[PDB]
Write a protein of this length. Structure first.
Ligand SMILES: *[C@@H]1O[C@H](CO)[C@@H](O[C@@H]2O[C@H](CO)[C@@H](O)[C@H](O)[C@H]2NC(C)=O)[C@H](O)[C@H]1NC(C)=O
Ligand SMILES: *[C@@H]1O[C@H](CO)[C@@H](O[C@@H]2O[C@H](CO)[C@@H](O)[C@H](O)[C@H]2NC(C)=O)[C@H](O)[C@H]1NC(C)=O
Ligand code: NAG
Length: 285
């Protein structure tokens, strides 16, 4: 169980198979991927040593995406899918683009980061939403940090035009809900991959993002005053048979050597303590 409101009892499959296999991918930071621009300053034709929240080059992502249609399996809402959120996580999210009746769509999972996922605590939610405006599909990231009454078995659904067996049910809250943060951010519905840094330091939750290139850029922060402990990528139920990828690898406080080109772009990165050559390279400015 994720949150502890019994929101639904419709098409829940509690009988227990094996635990699903989670696909893996090797972390490669060489072209800048996994790094973010420094918000307070732009760098040009230079290379910089700094401390940040970075993944371990050479370790793995896990594809945390769960695609469904009608049946929600209870296994989806436990480890290894409910996972630990310590220092932070770096996300590599495929923008699944499926074509139906002349229209290309934009679908990928939503993620919640929280402690207990009870309405006595604050949970972060990053949920995509698309809407048809002037016969052209636009995309938003709906970002909020609230005292959500999260559900046991939280899911999202795809665009109605792709059809749905299920309603969307990841929290249940009729009244007013206290929110530390809420705003929407647009994203390019034509992007192949979206990239996310989520981390926490000194009671503050941070977030970075990009839908262009491989190097993220500051999205928001908010002071929570508490420590978050878990993340859950929610299953996305839909009638289209589509392929979802939500690759997550942990961040830790590390030292990276980043190279900035003439346009201010991070085009190369080195994880200093990852391998022996990276150690030496960082030790030679
Ligand atoms: C805050 O969360 C709880 C759920 O954890 C909400 O509802 C009650 O919770 C208790 C214990 O979990 C259950 O035994 C009750 O059955 C729940 N109520 C109902 C009507 O089912 C509680 O209402 C939430 N508060 C707000 C303001 O959303
Ligand atoms: C973030 O975007 C969503 C989607 O555009 C906004 O939700 C809509 O708001 C209108 C008016 O408040 C409602 O009548 C619609 O039903 C909402 N759409 C859905 C799908 O729920 C939301 O208000 C935006 N929030 C912020 C803070 O910008
Ligand atoms: C580095 O940056 C400057 C900034 O104008 C640019 O003109 C120059 O061509 C770049 N390349 C080198 C090798 O300095």
């Amino acid at each position: 169980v994720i949150g502890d409101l019994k929101c639904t009892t419709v098409s829940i499959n509690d009988v227990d198979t094996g635990v699903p296999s989670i696909s893996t991918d090797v972390v490669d930071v060489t072209n800048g991927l996994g790094t973010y621009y420094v918000l307070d300053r732009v760098y040009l034709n230079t290379t910089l040593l700094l401390n940040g929240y970075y993944p371990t080059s050479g370790s793995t992502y896990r594809n945390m995406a769960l695609k469904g249609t009608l049946l929600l399996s209870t296994l989806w809402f436990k480890p290894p899918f409910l996972s630990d959120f310590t220092a932070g996580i770096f996300a590599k999210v495929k923008n699944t683009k499926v074509v139906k009746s002349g229209v290309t769509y934009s679908e990928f999972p939503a993620i919640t980061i929280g402690s207990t996922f009870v309405n006595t605590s604050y949970s972060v939610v990053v949920q995509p939403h698309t809407t048809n405006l002037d016969n052209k599909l636009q995309g938003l990231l709906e970002i909020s940090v609230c005292q959500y009454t999260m559900c046991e078995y939280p899911n999202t659904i795809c665009h109605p035009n792709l059809g749905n067996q299920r309603v969307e049910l990841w929290h249940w809250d009729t009244g007013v809900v206290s929110c530390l943060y809420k705003r929407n951010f647009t994203y390019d519905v034509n992007a192949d991959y979206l990239y996310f840094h989520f981390y926490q330091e000194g009671g503050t939750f941070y977030a970075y993002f990009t839908d262009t290139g491989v190097v993220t850029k500051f999205l928001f922060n908010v002071y929570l005053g508490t420590v978050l402990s878990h993340y859950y990528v929610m299953p996305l139920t839909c009638n289209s048979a589509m392929t979802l990828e939500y690759w997550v690898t942990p961040l830790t406080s590390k030292q990276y050597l980043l190279a900035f080109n003439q346009d201010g772009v991070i085009f190369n990165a080195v994880d200093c303590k990852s391998d022996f050559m990276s150690e030496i390279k960082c030790k030679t400015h």
